[PDB]
Design goal:
This protein is an alpha/beta fold. About 50% of the residues lie in helices and about 15% in strands. It has a five-stranded mixed β-sheet with strand order 3-2-1-4-5. It binds calcium ion (5 copies). The site of one calcium ion (CA) has 7 residues, from strand 1 and helix 4. It binds one DNA strand through helix 3.
DNA sequence: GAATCAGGTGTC
């Protein structure tokens, strides 16, 4: 009832959610969704099965206005994952062709460029948020698969860059990449300033990012 | 789908 209630009062309402807070590699992805038609079975995203999420997606993209926003591994390393997530969400809102007057954002502590409110477990209280969580996850899983193709030695298509045993194995065996979040503890502990300087000289990371991670390596660790 | 192992970080 959330959505409809908020629509009476505010007009165009979008639901916003992100995917990729907790992984070790790749961008964080956010989606903003405005939806008027009914879509049955929207219940969350991490609550669903991959087969299902693909089914609801096809219907969500038929019936809903969607905006997708991304913040890169560099932005995560420089701004932290909270601020990177906020940025991806604000970018999702900009990418929505329909301009929302109010937003419902999954989680808490988040104020976007559009006035709205935060719902803990929003993904299971709101259909709009539930839809956004599906779009976010699916779209990001698509990007991650694309990386596996770019980095054949890494099973990105399976673990989606999260800290699974297999992913950690691949990092030790194959080495840290620029798409890893170099500020994240497990990646940071396998890094050397040697490889970091190599990334920089090859131009694979920015100076600002080089500088930040070099400082973190030094602080590693008391 | 739900339990229950694993393992990332931010707000307060
Ligand atoms: Ca989510
Ligand atoms: Ca969320
Ligand atoms: Ca949740
Ligand atoms: Ca610093
Ligand atoms: Ca395991």
């Amino acid at each position: 009832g959330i959505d409809e209630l908020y629509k009476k009062e505010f007009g165009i309402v979008a639901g916003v959610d992100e995917a990729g807070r907790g992984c070790l590699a790749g961008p964080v992805v956010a989606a903003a969704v405005v939806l008027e038609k009914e879509i049955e079975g929207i219940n969350d995203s991490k609550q669903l099965s991959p087969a299902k999420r693909e089914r609801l997606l096809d219907e969500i993209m038929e019936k809903a206005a969607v905006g997708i926003g991304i913040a890169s591994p560099e932005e995560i390393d420089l701004y932290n994952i909270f601020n990177a997530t906020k940025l991806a969400m604000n970018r999702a809102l900009e990418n929505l062709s329909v301009k929302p007057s109010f937003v419902l954002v999954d989680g808490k502590g988040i104020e976007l460029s559009v006035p709205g409110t935060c719902l803990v477990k929003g993904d299971q209280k709101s259909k709009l948020i539930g839809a956004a969580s599906i779009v976010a996850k699916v779209f990001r899983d698509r990007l991650m698969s694309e990386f596996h193709r770019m980095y054949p030695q890494f099973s990105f298509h399976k673990h989606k860059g999260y800290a699974t045993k297999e992913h950690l194995n691949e990092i030790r065996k194959n080495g840290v990449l620029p798409i890893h979040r170099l500020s994240f503890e497990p990646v940071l502990e396998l890094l050397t300033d040697d490889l970091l300087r190599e990334f920089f000289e090859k131009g694979l990371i920015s100076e600002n990012r080089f500088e930040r991670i070099l400082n973190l390596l030094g602080a590693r660790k008391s």
